[PDB]
């Protein structure tokens, strides 16, 4: 039978941490999508619409990781795209229809399979309009892309060449409906926190009655992102019709020290395991300490770049060690201590 | 032949709240049908906010209609010679619906959606040229006034025997949709004298000022000229239809009155799983307030339902011994969870 | 490659995918070789955005290039054209993954030292309590 | 042609190259005939030193007056990357620059004429003898 | 009826399936052609018959008309079958010709 959301959540939890809200929305949507596919009519006398998902989260919050991991557990066609590459029709940039072609290729050019599938569009915030009002100048990669996607999300037939445009004069373009194709958007939306701050927080002027946050009690971006409405995105710059196509919005909290520590060893493709395998294939063993992970998390959080910061710290710590390690010989195991991260000590070496 | 009563009555099931828009649509169809049996024409223009039912009306009109009908988008349209589609392609889609009957196509109706997207704009020095603005409006304007335009000869087979069908669009009726953004601001300058610092000067607060729906009702062609549309384009269309923002009462009806009501959609989703669902009138009232606050039309309603049944639907299939589900106003407020009926 | 000439997709400037086309020429148009190839970038500091410039005006040379290189750097399928001269939507292009390709960016950031000194030192101030720092005491670039 | 319409590169789009294009259209895109053509400029004024184009527009004309090769479309069409541009040498094209200057006479008067301008005994232009200008 | 158009279809589709870029040869000297004389040389002009090269391609027995860009400007080209001489793939040596038609004279 169809898997329950709890099962799907467990698979994603293996690779993602601290994103319970995002995992719940994705699991529920996938669960509903499977039911819609199971029943052709999907209802006796009603039509069930699709609720497109939006994923607003800070950098390195596992937005793209969720889509990649979900593809492994999924069965129906899945595809990822980049909004920056997309451009309105009649320009050098890639067309919107090309997105469906990628999904169409995954299902062996089966129109029926493509009719029911999941689509992921990353970097949606990059195509955001500069201002809420209409742009005085044409935006090929901005407002134009959004306007073109309005019909696609709502549901409309699309023309795609089966094998090659030049294979035939017209190719009898395959007609594929997108009224039952789920779409998941992902973006960083840098600076959006300022918009919610202006709306939520008031009375910041110079006065006795006016209150000052003092930059210490100010709501963090993670918690502040939770409070969001379509009007906020409008100020940031986005077509209101586009927001109407995305009814469900999910927020991802910023990773904490405890969350980062888990990422070092808990996930399958963990940073520590990656370097361990790199040293293992060379003929060396590696060891880690809990104190070292704690210090790395603190420094990584200070970088303000998400999980990517971890790779920066570890790489700088093993720069000298990795440089002179192959030159040496008779070494079997390496041990990393907290002092090594601080730079006041060198990693210990074990000789066979 | 059919009087506008059954047209508006049958159409009332799917769309509720819009009064003036329905009358204009039914009148146009009634006049078109009478004219078809035996002068001129009158094109319709729909200027309404997002989620007002513009696209919904066209879909419902197709079912009630008994002549060729097709829905097209203006974004894909591009000037001739470019990779993008051309205005002539619209006629081709119409032919596909009528089995490519030239005579039937001439008496068919064509509806274009998202027309506000195309508009004369800046030179864009970085790009080579603008092919989706004035270039596509002049060719389209020629089609509105009524002119023969070359189209593929029905695409039945590789060789249609030199048919080269050209269809006169004079008899064909053209209806334009689109949800213009910022038009209310343009109308404000013409209908608002302004504000002054003096006591006598009238100042309007955010609440006292009229909403976009009121300004849209007072729209004139002059406003559309400076908005980015050709003056001759709007002049060709002699009928202007305007919608208005929905109300709490209208939103409440949409939740359960239409045959494709949002509540019925989720109910069927739960019924197929062997679980019953119930709704309360008080809950719908709260949902209308939240949806109206979002300012996204009827689409905002879905955002509230999904947010309320997120945790519920996540754990509902895992659990067993569930017979019915009851939702109260407190659930919408986020201070409780839906009640479950076991056994 | 040179980041200055780069421009986001949909403009007269060459697209970011053109870089992959250059790599393919070196490896005799081998998809497998390109996936394991190395890429160097210069003038990366020039594409830096202008904080003073308002966001109302779109930047394709500096901001558009950075936004486009995100997916390419992290690893994504790129529809590299066969020759790179033009990229028509109807035209067919080769698919080359960048999940394993390595990129090296370089650039002489002008004025970066000033920003670092302001944050690291924070010694400005004329008041009696505020500390005074001599120009010689300032650290080297 | 009108000098005011011309703009520097990177602006709205008017360029000095378009001037040669107009000349070619008159001679049916004949490069040899264009070299012998007599080019004329009108309304040279209103463009000068006080960013805005201003004097920058004039700077593009420098190479044109002295003589240089200019890229022009093959058949007077919009610039397309998928095409070649013909080269026309302007080293033999005579240039006639004409314009109406407003205020230049006042500058010359201070230099050559001896008057106290705004003065009780100073001469004023009330005699209506515009011929002196 | 003349054998030039029916033969053109067979050779045109045959080259397409072979993945070769088919090209057509036109005789501008014969009347009815519509092509620029500047490009035509030796009383003949090679017009690409591939679908991408032209627009709104339609092949009929009476006449064939295509939309193509000559020098970067859009233009309309219509040529009668009598003017057509041979169809061959310019990329490779493979080529075929049309036998003389009596009705055309």
């Amino acid at each position: 039978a169809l898997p329950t959301p709890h099962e799907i959540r467990n698979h994603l939890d293996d690779y993602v941490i601290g994103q319970e809200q995002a995992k719940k929305v994705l699991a529920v949507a996938v669960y509903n999508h499977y039911k819609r596919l199971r029943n052709g009519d999907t209802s006796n006398g009603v039509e069930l619409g699709k609720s497109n998902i939006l994923l607003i989260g800070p950098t390195g919050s596992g937005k793209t990781l969720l889509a990649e991991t979900l593809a492994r557990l999924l069965d129906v066609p899945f595809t990822m795209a980049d909004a920056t590459t997309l451009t309105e029709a009649g320009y050098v940039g890639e067309d919107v229809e090309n997105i469906i072609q990628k999904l169409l290729q995954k299902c062996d050019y089966d129109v029926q399979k493509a009719q029911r599938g999941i689509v992921y569009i990353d970097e949606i915030d990059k195509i955001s309009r500069k201002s809420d009002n209409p742009s005085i100048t044409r935006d090929v990669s901005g407002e134009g892309v959004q306007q073109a996607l309005l019909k696609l999300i709502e549901g409309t037939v699309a023309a795609v060449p089966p094998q090659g445009g030049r294979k035939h004069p017209q190719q009898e373009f395959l007609q594929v409906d997108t009224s039952k194709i789920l779409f998941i958007c992902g973006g960083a939306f840098a600076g959006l926190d300022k918009v919610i701050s202006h709306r939520v927080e008031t009375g910041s002027g110079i006065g006795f009655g006016a209150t000052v946050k003092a930059k210490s009690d100010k709501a963090s971006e993670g918690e502040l992102l939770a409070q969001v409405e379509p009007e906020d995105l409008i100020k940031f710059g986005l077509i209101p019709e586009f927001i109407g196509r995305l009814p469900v919005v999910a927020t991802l909290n910023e990773l904490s020290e405890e969350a980062l520590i888990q990422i070092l060893k808990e996930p399958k493709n963990a940073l520590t395991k990656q370097y361990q395998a790199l040293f293992n294939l060379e003929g060396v063993d590696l060891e880690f300490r809990d104190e070292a992970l704690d210090a790395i998390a603190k420094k990584a959080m200070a970088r303000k770049t998400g999980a990517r910061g971890l790779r920066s710290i570890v790489e700088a710590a093993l720069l000298d060690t990795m440089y002179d390690l192959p030159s040496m010989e008779d070494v079997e195991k390496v041990v990393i201590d907290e002092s090594v991260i601080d730079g006041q000590s060198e990693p210990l070496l074990i000789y066979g | 032949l059919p009087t506008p009563h059954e047209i508006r009555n049958h159409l009332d099931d799917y769309v509720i709240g819009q009064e003036q828009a329905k009358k204009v649509l039914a009148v146009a169809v009634y006049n078109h049908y009478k004219r078809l049996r035996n002068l001129g024409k009158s094109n319709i223009l729909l200027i309404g906010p997002t989620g007002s039912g513009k696209t919904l009306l066209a879909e419902t009109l197709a079912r009630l209609l008994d002549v060729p009908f097709t829905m097209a988008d203006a974004t894909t349209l591009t000037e001739a010679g470019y990779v993008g589609e051309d205005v002539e392609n619209i006629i081709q889609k119409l032919l596909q619906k009528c089995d490519y009957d030239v005579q039937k196509a001439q008496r068919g109706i064509v509806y274009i959606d998202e027309i506000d997207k195309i508009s004369r704009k800046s030179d864009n020095p970085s790009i080579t040229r603008d092919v989706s603005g004035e270039g596509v409006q002049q060719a389209l304007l020629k089609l509105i006034e009524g002119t023969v335009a070359a189209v593929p000869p029905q695409g039945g087979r590789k060789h249609p025997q030199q048919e080269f069908l050209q269809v006169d669009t004079s008899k064909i009726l053209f209806i334009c949709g689109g949800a213009f953004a910022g038009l209310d601001k343009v109308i404000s300058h013409r209908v608002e004298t302004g504000s002054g610092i003096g006591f006598g000067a009238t100042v309007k607060a955010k609440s006292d000022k009229a909403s976009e729906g009121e300004l849209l009702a007072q729209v004139e062609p002059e406003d559309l000229i400076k908005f980015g549309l050709i003056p001759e384009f709007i002049g060709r269309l002699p009928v202007v239809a305007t919608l208005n923002e929905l109300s709490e009462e209208a939103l409440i009806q949409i939740l359960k009155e239409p045959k494709n009501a949002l509540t019925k959609q989720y109910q069927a989703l739960f019924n197929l799983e062997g679980v019953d669902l119930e709704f309360r009138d008080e809950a719908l009232d709260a949902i209308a307030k939240k949806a109206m606050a979002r300012k996204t039309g009827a689409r905002g309603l879905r955002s509230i339902v999904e947010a309320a049944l997120l945790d519920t639907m996540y754990d509902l299939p895992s659990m067993e011994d569930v017979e019915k589900v009851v939702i109260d106003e407190s659930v919408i407020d986020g201070q409780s969870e839906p009640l479950l009926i076991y056994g | 490659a040179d980041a200055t000439t780069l421009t986001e997709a949909g403009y007269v400037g060459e697209d970011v995918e053109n870089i992959i086309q250059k790599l393919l020429q070196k490896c005799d148009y081998d998809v497998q070789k390109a996936q394991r190839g190395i890429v160097y970038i210069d003038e990366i500091d020039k594409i830096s955005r202008k904080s003073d410039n308002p966001s109302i005006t779109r930047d394709v040379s500096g901001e558009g290039v950075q936004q486009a290189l995100l997916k390419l750097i992290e690893g994504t399928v790129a529809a590299v054209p066969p020759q790179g001269g033009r990229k028509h939507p109807q035209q067919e292009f080769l698919q080359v993954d960048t999940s394993k390709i390595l990129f090296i960016c370089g650039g002489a950031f002008a004025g970066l030292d000033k920003v670092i000194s302001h944050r690291v030192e924070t010694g400005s101030g004329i008041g009696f309590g505020a500390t005074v720092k001599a120009k010689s005491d300032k650290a080297s670039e | 042609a009108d000098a005011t319409t011309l703009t520097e590169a990177g602006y709205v789009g008017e360029d000095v190259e378009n001037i040669i294009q107009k000349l070619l259209q008159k001679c049916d895109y004949d490069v040899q005939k264009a070299q012998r053509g007599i080019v004329y400029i009108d309304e040279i004024d209103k463009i000068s030193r006080k960013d805005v184009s201003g004097e920058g527009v004039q700077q593009a004309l420098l190479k044109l007056i002295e003589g240089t090769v200019a890229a022009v479309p093959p058949q007077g069409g919009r610039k397309h990357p998928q095409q070649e541009f013909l080269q026309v040498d302007t080293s033999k094209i005579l240039f006639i620059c004409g314009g109406a200057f407003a205020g230049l006479d006042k500058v010359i008067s201070h230099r050559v004429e001896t008057g106290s301008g705004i003065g009780f005994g100073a001469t004023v232009k009330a005699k209506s003898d515009k011929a002196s200008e | 009826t003349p054998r030039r158009p029916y033969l053109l279809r067979a050779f045109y589709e045959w080259l397409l399936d072979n993945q070769l870029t088919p090209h057509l040869v036109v005789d501008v000297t014969l009347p009815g052609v519509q092509v620029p004389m500047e490009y035509a040389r030796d009383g003949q002009i090679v017009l690409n018959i591939a679908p991408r090269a032209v627009g709104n391609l339609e092949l009929a027995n009476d006449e064939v008309r295509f939309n193509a860009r000559f020098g970067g400007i859009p233009r309309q080209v219509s040529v009668p079958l009598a003017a057509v001489l041979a169809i061959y793939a310019r990329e490779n040596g493979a080529g075929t010709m049309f036998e003389p038609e009596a009705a055309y004279d």
Partner: peptide, 11 residues
């Protein structure tokens, strides 16, 4: 080829 290899163009 007097005619261009591609009739459709992109701005």
């Amino acid at each position: 080829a007097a005619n261009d290899e591609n009739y459709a163009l992109a701005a």
